[PDB]
Design an enzyme around this catalytic site. Structure first.
Site, PDB file in Angstrom:
ATOM      1  N   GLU A 169       0.872  -1.207   0.000  1.00 58.31           N
ATOM      2  CA  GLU A 169       0.000   0.000   0.000  1.00 58.31           C
ATOM      3  C   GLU A 169       0.900   1.245   0.000  1.00 58.31           C
ATOM      4  OE1 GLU A 169      -1.871   1.764   3.412  1.00 58.31           O
ATOM      5  OE2 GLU A 169      -3.826   1.762   2.428  1.00 58.31           O
ATOM      6  N   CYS A 171      -8.419   9.059   6.284  1.00 51.25           N
ATOM      7  CA  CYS A 171      -8.460   8.789   7.747  1.00 51.25           C
ATOM      8  C   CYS A 171      -7.159   9.269   8.383  1.00 51.25           C
ATOM      9  CB  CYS A 171      -8.626   7.309   8.058  1.00 51.25           C
ATOM     10  SG  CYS A 171     -10.221   6.683   7.487  1.00 51.25           S
ATOM     11  N   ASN A 217      -2.011   1.380  10.283  1.00 50.11           N
ATOM     12  CA  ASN A 217      -1.610   2.782  10.008  1.00 50.11           C
ATOM     13  C   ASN A 217      -0.327   3.109  10.781  1.00 50.11           C
ATOM     14  OD1 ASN A 217      -5.092   3.679  10.149  1.00 50.11           O
ATOM     15  ND2 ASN A 217      -3.901   3.285   8.279  1.00 50.11           N
TER      16      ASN A 217
HETATM   17  C1  LIG Z   1      -6.283   0.484   5.969  1.00 47.79           C
HETATM   18  N1  LIG Z   1      -7.196  -0.485   5.373  1.00 47.79           N
HETATM   19  C2  LIG Z   1      -8.162   0.012   4.392  1.00 47.79           C
HETATM   20  C3  LIG Z   1      -9.551   0.199   4.983  1.00 47.79           C
HETATM   21  C4  LIG Z   1     -10.600   0.627   4.153  1.00 47.79           C
HETATM   22  N2  LIG Z   1     -11.854   0.806   4.619  1.00 47.79           N
HETATM   23  C5  LIG Z   1     -12.113   0.570   5.923  1.00 47.79           C
HETATM   24  N3  LIG Z   1     -13.346   0.724   6.458  1.00 47.79           N
HETATM   25  C6  LIG Z   1     -13.582   0.477   7.775  1.00 47.79           C
HETATM   26  N4  LIG Z   1     -14.837   0.655   8.259  1.00 47.79           N
HETATM   27  N5  LIG Z   1     -12.613   0.058   8.635  1.00 47.79           N
HETATM   28  C7  LIG Z   1     -11.335  -0.128   8.224  1.00 47.79           C
HETATM   29  N6  LIG Z   1     -10.390  -0.532   9.097  1.00 47.79           N
HETATM   30  C8  LIG Z   1     -11.007   0.118   6.803  1.00 47.79           C
HETATM   31  N7  LIG Z   1      -9.758  -0.047   6.296  1.00 47.79           N
HETATM   32  C9  LIG Z   1      -7.072  -1.858   5.688  1.00 47.79           C
HETATM   33  C10 LIG Z   1      -5.957  -2.322   6.392  1.00 47.79           C
HETATM   34  C11 LIG Z   1      -5.801  -3.673   6.687  1.00 47.79           C
HETATM   35  C12 LIG Z   1      -6.749  -4.601   6.286  1.00 47.79           C
HETATM   36  C13 LIG Z   1      -6.532  -6.064   6.594  1.00 47.79           C
HETATM   37  O1  LIG Z   1      -5.803  -6.368   7.532  1.00 47.79           O
HETATM   38  N8  LIG Z   1      -7.082  -6.966   5.759  1.00 47.79           N
HETATM   39  C14 LIG Z   1      -6.885  -8.408   5.797  1.00 47.79           C
HETATM   40  C15 LIG Z   1      -8.190  -9.087   6.210  1.00 47.79           C
HETATM   41  C16 LIG Z   1      -8.560  -8.829   7.671  1.00 47.79           C
HETATM   42  C17 LIG Z   1      -9.969  -9.326   7.926  1.00 47.79           C
HETATM   43  O2  LIG Z   1     -10.931  -8.564   7.672  1.00 47.79           O
HETATM   44  O3  LIG Z   1     -10.121 -10.483   8.377  1.00 47.79           O
HETATM   45  C18 LIG Z   1      -6.486  -8.953   4.445  1.00 47.79           C
HETATM   46  O4  LIG Z   1      -5.987 -10.099   4.377  1.00 47.79           O
HETATM   47  O5  LIG Z   1      -6.675  -8.258   3.417  1.00 47.79           O
HETATM   48  C19 LIG Z   1      -7.861  -4.149   5.572  1.00 47.79           C
HETATM   49  C20 LIG Z   1      -8.020  -2.798   5.280  1.00 47.79           C
HETATM   50  O1  LIG Z   2      -6.445   3.619   6.996  1.00 46.76           O
HETATM   51  C1  LIG Z   2      -7.561   3.517   7.506  1.00 46.76           C
HETATM   52  C2  LIG Z   2      -8.800   3.501   6.785  1.00 46.76           C
HETATM   53  C3  LIG Z   2      -9.954   3.396   7.467  1.00 46.76           C
HETATM   54  N1  LIG Z   2     -10.006   3.330   8.841  1.00 46.76           N
HETATM   55  C4  LIG Z   2     -11.293   3.178   9.547  1.00 46.76           C
HETATM   56  C5  LIG Z   2     -11.663   4.302  10.505  1.00 46.76           C
HETATM   57  C6  LIG Z   2     -13.183   4.226  10.460  1.00 46.76           C
HETATM   58  O2  LIG Z   2     -13.654   3.142  11.250  1.00 46.76           O
HETATM   59  C7  LIG Z   2     -13.434   3.956   8.979  1.00 46.76           C
HETATM   60  C8  LIG Z   2     -13.539   5.181   8.108  1.00 46.76           C
HETATM   61  O3  LIG Z   2     -14.841   5.781   8.310  1.00 46.76           O
HETATM   62  P1  LIG Z   2     -14.993   7.394   8.448  1.00 46.76           P
HETATM   63  O4  LIG Z   2     -14.133   7.811   9.609  1.00 46.76           O
HETATM   64  O5  LIG Z   2     -14.608   8.021   7.148  1.00 46.76           O
HETATM   65  O6  LIG Z   2     -16.469   7.542   8.785  1.00 46.76           O
HETATM   66  O7  LIG Z   2     -12.315   3.144   8.556  1.00 46.76           O
HETATM   67  C9  LIG Z   2      -8.855   3.327   9.606  1.00 46.76           C
HETATM   68  O8  LIG Z   2      -8.872   3.247  10.827  1.00 46.76           O
HETATM   69  N2  LIG Z   2      -7.692   3.438   8.883  1.00 46.76           N
END
Ligand SMILES: CN(Cc1cnc2nc(N)nc(N)c2n1)c1ccc(C(=O)N[C@@H](CCC(=O)O)C(=O)O)cc1
Ligand SMILES: O=c1ccn([C@H]2C[C@H](O)[C@@H](COP(=O)(O)O)O2)c(=O)[nH]1
Length: 287
Positions: free
Chosen positions: A63, A171, A202
């Site tokens: 990423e 975020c 993050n």
């Molecule tokens: C920063 N990010 C993007 C992202 C986008 N929309 C979101 N939206 C929400 N509501 N919450 C988040 N944490 C979020 N994160 C991430 C970071 C890590 C993983 C992660 O660890 N994914 C695992 C799966 C983990 C699981 O859900 O079991 C993988 O194998 O891809 C996913 C999204």
């Molecule tokens: O890098 C990222 C991307 C997303 N989120 C989480 C925060 C919130 O739970 C959600 C984003 O929703 P809003 O804050 O935009 O409503 O995803 C993170 O913590 N880190």
């Protein structure tokens, strides 16, 4: 001995005990504390990658390299096995956000585009933006090298004019850098932190970025200050986080770089070596 990871665990403990139960914009139940601050040592190669539950390090690195390319095509990340942005680039999500004219995978002018092409007119992910807009990432490297004491060393994704074009508003909102005693430090302002999934990812991401910038600038590393706006736990993660909170942290891993890396654009997945990261079993937390 890893008192810094114990800080993260104490934040989670504090939110579960004292946080306000609020339904978020999606209707999902959260437990929320507004305004939290924590400091992580980055000294002597240390990256704050949580040891009490596996962090998706492959995802963190791919990423970050994709951000640095100024890339906004989710497909390019998906092609490396990293699916974390795929939902936000889907035909369904695009149509639902009123981006019906966009090609699948197009996340709009998100982090990578803002970092390298700040203020340029977004015309889709397939356009070559070379030299268009303000290259904030090159500008902050120039400030660190030439004016290390600057109070103006800011990397921002919060482009208000572009928010309406983004798949999601940023975020990790802005990061400020500072040099003291030839040590590069970073303060990350995160408006919204999911303590379960997002925040550990993050923290690893900005820890790594600070090491990469320090490497390019011939500097040592200092500390990462993490500033949270809405520090929240999803109600559906509470049982999983209670399991994690029973675990004692291990020492954080270190990072080192291999090859001749002269600029921020010269890093590859292979150039980044994570040492002594043996976390405790991953804990599944749904989206
Ligand atoms: C920063 N990010 C993007 C992202 C986008 N929309 C979101 N939206 C929400 N509501 N919450 C988040 N944490 C979020 N994160 C991430 C970071 C890590 C993983 C992660 O660890 N994914 C695992 C799966 C983990 C699981 O859900 O079991 C993988 O194998 O891809 C996913 C999204
Ligand atoms: O890098 C990222 C991307 C997303 N989120 C989480 C925060 C919130 O739970 C959600 C984003 O929703 P809003 O804050 O935009 O409503 O995803 C993170 O913590 N880190």
């Amino acid at each position: 001995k890893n008192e810094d990871e114990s800080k993260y665990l104490d934040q989670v403990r504090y939110i579960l005990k004292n946080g306000e139960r609020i339904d978020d914009r999606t209707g999902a139940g959260t437990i929320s504390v507004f305004g939290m601050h924590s400091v992580y040592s980055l000294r002597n190669g240390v990256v704050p990658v949580l040891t009490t539950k596996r962090v998706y390090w492959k995802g963190v690195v791919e990423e970050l390299l994709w951000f640095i390319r100024g890339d906004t095509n989710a497909k390019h990340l998906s092609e490396k096995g990293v699916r974390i942005w795929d939902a936000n680039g889907s035909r369904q999500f695009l149509d639902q956000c009123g981006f019906s004219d966009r090609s699948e995978g197009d996340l709009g002018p998100i982090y990578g585009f803002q970092w390298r092409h700040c203020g340029a007119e977004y015309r889709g992910m397939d356009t070559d933006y070379t030299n268009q807009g303000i290259d904030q990432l090159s500008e902050i490297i120039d400030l660190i090298k030439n004016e290390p004491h600057s109070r103006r060393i800011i990397l921002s994704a919060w482009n208000v004019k572009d928010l309406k074009l983004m798949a999601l508003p940023p975020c990790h909102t802005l990061a400020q850098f500072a040099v003291r005693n030839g040590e590069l430090s970073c303060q990350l302002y995160q408006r919204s932190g999911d303590m379960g999934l997002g925040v550990p990812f993050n923290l690893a991401s900005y820890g790594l970025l600070t090491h990469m910038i320090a490497h390019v600038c011939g500097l040592k590393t200092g500390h990462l200050c993490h500033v949270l706006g809405d520090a929240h736990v999803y109600m559906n993660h509470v049982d999983a986080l209670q399991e994690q909170l029973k675990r004692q942290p291990r020492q954080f891993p270190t990072v080192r770089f291999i090859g001749n890396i002269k600029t921020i654009d010269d890093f590859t997945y292979e150039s980044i070596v994570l040492e002594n990261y043996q976390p405790m079993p991953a804990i599944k937390m749904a989206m």
